[PDB]
């Protein structure tokens, strides 16, 4: 028996609104410590790692580990049937090939029951090494999304160049070029609206903007976003899920 009661259900909705466009299908690993997901997109250029820790839920029960082959399209379709203020319960058995989703409205007098068909999956998982990165930039999520959106008008690629005092995003195309320079902020009057940079060595990397534009659909999950970059390795775009866990987008560079 697996049962997770989550009061702030909208979170999960957001989780599915940040995934279903990048990955159509994924394996959801359910354990006593919570929910884990890892999945490359069909082009294997990007990867996603989702973590929803058990303490994030209002209640949580998981006797034995379960691997749920899930169609994220249908799951997003089902989560579309849940309100923002809805309390959502996930429930699954062991000898059952489905996932139950119970939506409770704040009346209380409206109750929804949804049974999602689970599927078979032949997927690839990657071993991700626990490492330290040369550049770590913490910035507003909306700012990053806006930057990617804007530079998407210039070219296909974006050059992220991080120094110690500033982070720059550049783009070049047949109409010309564009440079966006964000300086470090004196966070003497704030905390989340600030742009901070932790640098060991200056880093310069080039990435595909379409994948980043796929990534920035996790913006409603957090007011902040962190970018981890090292030389000639995949970029990590992390969104923190408050009182819950995180969502990480890995993107292979253009060496």
């Amino acid at each position: 028996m697996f049962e997770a009661r989550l009061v702030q259900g909208s979170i999960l909705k957001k989780v599915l609104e940040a995934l279903k466009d990048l990955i159509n299908e994924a394996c959801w690993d359910i354990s006593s410590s919570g929910v884990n997901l890892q999945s490359m997109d069909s082009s294997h250029v990007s990867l996603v790692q989702l973590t929803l820790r058990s303490e994030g839920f209002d209640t949580y029960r998981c006797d034995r580990n379960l691997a749920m082959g899930v169609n994220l399209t249908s799951m997003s379709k089902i989560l579309k049937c849940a309100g923002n203020e809805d309390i959502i319960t996930l429930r699954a058995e062991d000898n059952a090939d489905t996932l139950a989703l119970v939506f409770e409205a704040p009346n209380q007098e409206k109750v929804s029951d949804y049974e999602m068909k689970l599927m078979d999956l032949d997927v690839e998982q990657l071993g991700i090494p626990e490492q330290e990165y040369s550049c770590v930039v913490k910035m507003p999520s909306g700012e990053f999304a806006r930057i990617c959106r804007d530079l998407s008008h210039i070219g296909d690629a974006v050059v992220i160049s991080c120094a110690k005092d500033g982070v720059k995003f550049s783009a070049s195309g047949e109409l010309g070029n564009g440079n966006i320079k964000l300086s470090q902020t004196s966070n003497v009057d704030k905390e989340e609206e600030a742009v901070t940079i932790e640098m060991n060595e200056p880093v310069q990397l080039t990435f595909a903007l379409r994948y980043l534009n796929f990534f920035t659909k996790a913006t409603p999950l957090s007011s902040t976003v962190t970018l981890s970059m090292s030389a000639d390795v995949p970029l990590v775009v992390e969104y923190k899920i408050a009182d819950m866990g995180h969502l990480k987008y890995y993107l292979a560079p253009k060496i």
């Binding site: 250029v45 078979d120 032949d122 995949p234 292979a252």
Partner: peptide, 20 residues
């Protein structure tokens, strides 16, 4: 730039069979 790499050029790929 020169070539768009993939995630499997950096991380080791583990194949998994999930039944449901």
């Amino acid at each position: 730039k020169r070539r768009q790499t993939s995630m499997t050029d950096f991380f080791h790929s583990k194949r998994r069979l999930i039944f449901s």
